[PDB]
Design a protein around this nucleic acid. Sequence first.
DNA 1: AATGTTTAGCTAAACAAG
DNA 2: AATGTTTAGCTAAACAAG
Lengths: 94, 95
Amino acid sequence: KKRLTESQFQEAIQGLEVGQQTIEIARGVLVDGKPQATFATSLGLTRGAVSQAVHRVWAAFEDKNLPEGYARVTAVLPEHQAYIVRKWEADAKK
Amino acid sequence: KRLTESQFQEAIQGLEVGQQTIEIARGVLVDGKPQATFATSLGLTRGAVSQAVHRVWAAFEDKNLPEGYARVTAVLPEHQAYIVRKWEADAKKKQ
DNA sequence: AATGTTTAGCTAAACAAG
DNA sequence: AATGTTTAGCTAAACAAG
């Protein structure tokens, strides 16, 4: 169970193109710790829809909290360079 | 954007794709038909037909990269992101 | 007018976790 | 059994270009 403080939630949704329903679901789950099931029930949504709603806000938070100084990069690379990049990632993981 | 039937089959190889999307994508990319023809015939929105074409085109773009090349995404220290950006230019210059 | 695009958001239903 | 995740495929409706 991923959780956010209100401060972290405010950061997550600042500038985010997100509707009121998604905000309410995400706050209830991530900030208040309520089950996603409660919103699926009350809003007449599939479990997958509620899962995606929480994920949209979580993903936004993650994008604003990358390690200090780090950049996301995407590139088409030859085999040996692609290997090096994946190994930088793998070694950073563990 | 246009494809031969061979390129089209390459595009969809290993792709999870249903026949309706295959029909739309072939019609547009291979046979050169407007997307509009499929929105009408299949009762779909324009955006659905546009996405259908996109799903197969994107798959083709990945298959059609040079042998041994791959699209990688990573979150890295700035200096390593810099190295990757340079490599990306080196690869473009070679191709 | 006509045609094609973008993306937040949702479905279906298999799947993964609890 | 209940609950949460994934993703090709869909719409909505606003935007892009002619």
